[PDB]
Amino acid sequence: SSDRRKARKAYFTAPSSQRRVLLSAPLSKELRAQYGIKALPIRRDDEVLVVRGSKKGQEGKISSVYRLKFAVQVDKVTKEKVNGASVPINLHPSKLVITKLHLDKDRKALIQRKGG
Amino acid sequence: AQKSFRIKQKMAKAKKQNRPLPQWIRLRTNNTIRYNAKRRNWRRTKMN
Amino acid sequence: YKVIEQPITSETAMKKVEDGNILVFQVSMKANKYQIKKAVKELYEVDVLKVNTLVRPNGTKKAYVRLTADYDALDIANRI
Amino acid sequence: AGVKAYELRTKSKEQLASQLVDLKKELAELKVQKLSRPSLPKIKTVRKSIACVLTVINEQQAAAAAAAAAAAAAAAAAAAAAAAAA
Amino acid sequence: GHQTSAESWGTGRAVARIPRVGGGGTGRSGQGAFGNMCRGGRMFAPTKTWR
RNA sequence: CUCUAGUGCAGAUCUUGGUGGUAGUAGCAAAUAUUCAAAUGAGAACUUUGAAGACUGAAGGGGGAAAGGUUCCACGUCAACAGCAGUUGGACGUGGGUUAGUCGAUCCUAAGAGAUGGGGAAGCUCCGUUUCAAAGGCCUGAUUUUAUGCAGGCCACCAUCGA
RNA sequence: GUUUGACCUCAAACAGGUAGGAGUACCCGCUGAACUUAAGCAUAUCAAUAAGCGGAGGAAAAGAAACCAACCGGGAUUGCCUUAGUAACGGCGAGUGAAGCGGCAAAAGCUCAAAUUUGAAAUCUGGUACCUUCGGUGCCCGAGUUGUAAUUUGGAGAGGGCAACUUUGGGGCCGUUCCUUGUCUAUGUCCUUGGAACAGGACGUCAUAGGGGGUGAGAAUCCCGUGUGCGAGGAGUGCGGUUCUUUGUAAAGUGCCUUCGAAGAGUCGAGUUGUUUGGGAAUGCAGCUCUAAGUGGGUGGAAAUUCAUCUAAAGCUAAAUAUUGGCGAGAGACCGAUAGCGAACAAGUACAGUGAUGGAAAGAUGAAAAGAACUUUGAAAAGAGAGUGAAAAAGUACGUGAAAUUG
RNA sequence: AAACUUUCAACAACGGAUCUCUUGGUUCUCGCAUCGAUGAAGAACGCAGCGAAAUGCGAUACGUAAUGUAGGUUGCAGAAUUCCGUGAAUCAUCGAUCUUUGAACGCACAUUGCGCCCCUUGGUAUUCCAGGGGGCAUGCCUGUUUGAGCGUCAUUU
């Protein structure tokens, strides 16, 4: 209901079906103007960009997507380590926007199923 | 004493739990204290 | 339940196979003296005399697998 | 991984006799892996060939069982009427 | 408030006549729900749905 | 712009906890002397080793059962923690070792008690077990085998449980 | 000797199915108390309940007249509003305290006999024999038709047969509804101070959806969702419509002919007690023991007597209603780590008690961990330069910070 | 005399409140509403590149299978290994799953230990054990094989 913690309850112990969707980020403007869709879920080999933030409007990709954590590693947002290893580094995917959507087998038929 | 059958693995369970507090605990918290309440000491508590 | 898990192959089983004959085993718990001996006899390929039992405070029952004279000891233990 | 469920059901009893014995031949290696430190790229194949060979063997039991006759005996089809006691 | 038991005892040990510690009782006072001046006992006017 | 409630703190030898107080004071564990040299080291009265003495020897020697249950052991650490130091510990952490027909784990008698069924009676429970029961010998019939095993007929002379 | 059988009393082993337990609340029944109040006080009263045990179910549990009104009239159980502190009881002291009538909600009714004394063609049953595997065959116990009527007695009130078939049921088909899966979620971009814009400034649209929460800062348009439309695939649990048999069997309506019927005894209640405060005390109700009639017996708070009214002592039945162990959604003048669920966090886990059990300490960086390379001093601790980064005036024991304590 | 003593200022230091916080309530409102011998709720002890250990699994062990869903590799995790880029595999369902042990249950016992009666199957010297399977004497109920007393008291001898 109207509740902070008890609304977050559903988000926290969300099933794996809902955790597909809750790996969310918006779509870019020429993806909306191509299709129609608001957001679509976020996966590994998508080209990404940072919306709100100091990392402002830079090019990136995603390295890893994680299931329970929700947070994704972002390629090109790269710092080192104390030992000196150039790693992709974490961000929560709300701070991101994807520029790639693939066509594939029948994601082609997902986005244009019965409603679309 | 002479031990029976179903005493032995209750005692084995107790001496297995005589190991330290799990080290996974303060990877979730990081540093901040989480203290626990069981194990067994030899001088003090016996088993059930 | 069922009888045999595996041998226990620490440095202790490398004492009592060179000198004192046996293969030290760590089987299941309700696996008695008769059951363990004939189960070794079919499985491993060795003839077996008195096989003994002892449970530690770890809960697991050991078995003391004594062999016959025509068979070996070292080429009985190290086959796996 | 090893064999598979839906394939075992569509077998015949003449083939399932071979499945029982020849699947648990590799099981001898799996117990040796526990002793020599386990590792999932060898040790992971230890589960479903207990009942999945026996239940598909008991397809020939259950589908033949509806042609019995006598009195007395229970465990076969007797504890089926539990949620039909009322 | 009746989720603890704490008894009277008086002098001879370090607790009062007030039900503070007895059959348990850390910061859970009262025999039943007793002691509003005691913290974790009862309230003065415990609010009710009946009123 | 006005209506509503668990609505003003100094106190029942009270209540939730830290901190103050005597106080760095006493205590520092029943009067079985200790002296001297070394090994190792950052540090040595204490670990460990040598020289030497006090001391006990119907126990400071030896050694099993109940009860407990791996505390022994080797490996390994000096942080927390030991009425002090500390090179040390069962604290701390990890694994191993315990092989019986053979030493204990049974029948019947005592203290004493149990299991089961129906009744007397309001239950508890007492009672029945004492005749069958339980166990054994002899005879007959059908089936099968290297053997076997079963069913029927016949035998009065005994009957509760635990060191 | 010996030959041949029925009922009372009233068994044991093989062999298909069927079942155990873990649990909360709701109700009915039974052995069945008390702290207390009249400031006290054995019999008012805590009370037919706790606690313990038994019984029934998914709802429990009740009920269709041996009723009220009062000559005007009406007709089950159950819940609610009027009612009622009235009508009565209790040192008339605390206290307890109905019924009837009108209105509102949701309201349909049935199983047993001329008792019983009960037996066969066939129907048809509990147990059980042969066959020896639920299939085929046989006997006794027996239920009414039926083969066929009485016993103990009585009336003029009233019933039954016969014919036409129809409806229910069963079978077949369709429509409606429910469940599940699957999909589009509308509406948005610019500019600027800047570390980030959800503020401010500029221009539009959806809105049915502007409740909500999450989002690097205030949100309709950034996200998760919602309103609203759409693909079909299964199911009979409900509801509606249609079709077949008049169902070789069971009931009702319609129409015609001909003629006459009943009763449940350990109960009614009783010497006496009592589950009821026995008081003149109904009823509810039967301990010890016995015990009554169907133009006759019973309800209506004394009896003679009269009027209106009901017909037990066998049995069954829907809802208005009570309640939770599990799951989801929404909200209430409803908290923000001393509150509240035991517990927001490895809280039953370092621990303590033989012991269902008691049970503390306990929350925390940023955008990105990049969680300090490198250099230099000291023995580790500790002390300084230097880098990373938006800021290091964010340095890992990571918010704001006071005092005793303490320079 | 400012050590010992007291106050102020400047410069800080050992302790540490409250509130905005917050995958946690409470209370109230609407709609549905338990599992189990085919082995319940629950413990034991196994199953990783490295491993204290979350989380899943548990003699085809981070699963197991058919179909609709492009980049998979849960968590501490950085990294390493291995496969693919317009038909990798993700998620709902159905089917597979059911180690030991708890109702627990071959049976006594002090839960994760541990031994009896019977059948089947295998090996071996007659014998004994093993591989494995089952029940009111683990609750109840039925059929079949097949039993007795005694009376009102039978048919014939």
Tab-separated table of C-alpha atoms (C1' of nucleotides) in Angstrom, chain A residues 1-5 7-8 10-11 18 21-22 24-27 29 32 36-40 51-56 79-82 87 89-92 94-95 110-116, chain G residues 182-190 192 194-198 211-217 219 221-225 229-231 329-331 335-336 344 367-373 388-390:
chain	number	residue	atom	x	y	z
A	1	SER	CA	0.000	0.000	0.000
A	2	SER	CA	1.066	3.568	0.765
A	3	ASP	CA	4.115	2.555	2.730
A	4	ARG	CA	7.872	2.957	2.169
A	5	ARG	CA	9.257	-0.321	3.554
A	7	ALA	CA	6.366	-1.304	-0.938
A	8	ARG	CA	10.098	-2.146	-1.023
A	10	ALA	CA	7.787	-6.633	-3.054
A	11	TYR	CA	10.887	-5.265	-4.843
A	18	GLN	CA	9.570	-9.995	-11.950
A	21	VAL	CA	11.559	-6.512	-15.646
A	22	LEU	CA	13.178	-4.861	-12.579
A	24	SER	CA	15.127	-1.774	-16.030
A	25	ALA	CA	16.441	1.388	-17.608
A	26	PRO	CA	14.741	3.733	-20.124
A	27	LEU	CA	15.119	3.615	-23.898
A	29	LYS	CA	14.683	8.831	-27.994
A	32	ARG	CA	10.994	5.326	-28.890
A	36	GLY	CA	6.963	3.160	-29.298
A	37	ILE	CA	8.088	1.370	-26.125
A	38	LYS	CA	8.957	3.106	-22.818
A	39	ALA	CA	11.597	0.790	-21.330
A	40	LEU	CA	12.845	-2.732	-22.058
A	51	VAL	CA	21.729	9.902	-18.152
A	52	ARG	CA	21.720	11.852	-14.857
A	53	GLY	CA	25.249	12.050	-13.481
A	54	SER	CA	28.763	13.506	-13.624
A	55	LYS	CA	29.679	10.753	-16.139
A	56	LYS	CA	27.542	12.883	-18.385
A	79	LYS	CA	39.100	2.739	-12.966
A	80	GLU	CA	42.102	0.652	-11.858
A	81	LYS	CA	42.830	-1.102	-8.528
A	82	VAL	CA	45.565	-0.765	-5.871
A	87	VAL	CA	38.181	-3.423	-14.309
A	89	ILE	CA	32.941	-0.938	-12.449
A	90	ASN	CA	29.449	-1.038	-10.950
A	91	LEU	CA	26.443	1.246	-11.434
A	92	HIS	CA	22.743	0.749	-10.687
A	94	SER	CA	18.440	3.451	-13.254
A	95	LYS	CA	21.429	5.786	-13.732
A	110	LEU	CA	7.990	-9.990	-28.991
A	111	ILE	CA	8.018	-6.231	-29.656
A	112	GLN	CA	5.510	-6.779	-32.486
A	113	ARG	CA	3.285	-9.554	-31.115
A	114	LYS	CA	-0.481	-8.851	-30.835
A	115	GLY	CA	-0.753	-5.344	-29.328
A	116	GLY	CA	2.055	-3.840	-31.401
G	182	G	C1'	-0.186	-13.615	-23.745
G	183	U	C1'	0.419	-8.356	-25.143
G	184	C	C1'	0.405	-2.806	-25.993
G	185	U	C1'	0.750	0.602	-20.755
G	186	A	C1'	-0.914	6.458	-22.693
G	187	U	C1'	1.744	11.354	-21.750
G	188	G	C1'	8.388	14.724	-23.429
G	189	U	C1'	11.410	17.502	-24.906
G	190	C	C1'	14.317	21.850	-24.654
G	192	U	C1'	20.449	27.076	-17.415
G	194	G	C1'	26.126	23.488	-11.574
G	195	G	C1'	28.769	17.943	-9.088
G	196	A	C1'	23.877	15.455	-10.306
G	197	A	C1'	17.815	19.259	-12.303
G	198	C	C1'	12.664	16.357	-10.283
G	211	G	C1'	-3.471	6.949	-4.969
G	212	G	C1'	1.382	5.016	-4.379
G	213	G	C1'	6.470	3.807	-3.886
G	214	G	C1'	11.127	3.923	-6.500
G	215	U	C1'	14.287	7.030	-9.382
G	216	G	C1'	22.370	10.667	-8.457
G	217	A	C1'	17.200	16.834	-5.476
G	219	A	C1'	7.668	13.799	-10.545
G	221	U	C1'	5.110	12.793	-18.996
G	222	C	C1'	12.711	9.183	-15.734
G	223	C	C1'	11.179	3.827	-13.636
G	224	C	C1'	8.146	-0.030	-11.376
G	225	G	C1'	2.741	-0.036	-11.615
G	229	G	C1'	-8.346	-2.514	-25.134
G	230	C	C1'	-6.966	-7.200	-27.468
G	231	G	C1'	-5.212	-12.963	-28.878
G	329	A	C1'	-4.177	-5.765	-2.181
G	330	G	C1'	-5.795	-1.159	0.055
G	331	A	C1'	-6.408	2.139	4.003
G	335	C	C1'	5.915	4.196	14.581
G	336	G	C1'	10.462	6.537	12.230
G	344	A	C1'	14.511	-3.768	11.011
G	367	A	C1'	28.270	8.730	-8.679
G	368	A	C1'	32.441	5.601	-9.002
G	369	A	C1'	36.202	1.787	-4.009
G	370	A	C1'	39.387	4.377	-7.488
G	371	G	C1'	39.565	1.584	0.060
G	372	A	C1'	45.990	5.346	-0.173
G	373	A	C1'	50.123	2.995	-5.549
G	388	U	C1'	43.479	8.884	-6.611
G	389	G	C1'	38.643	11.849	-6.742
G	390	A	C1'	33.560	16.355	-7.723
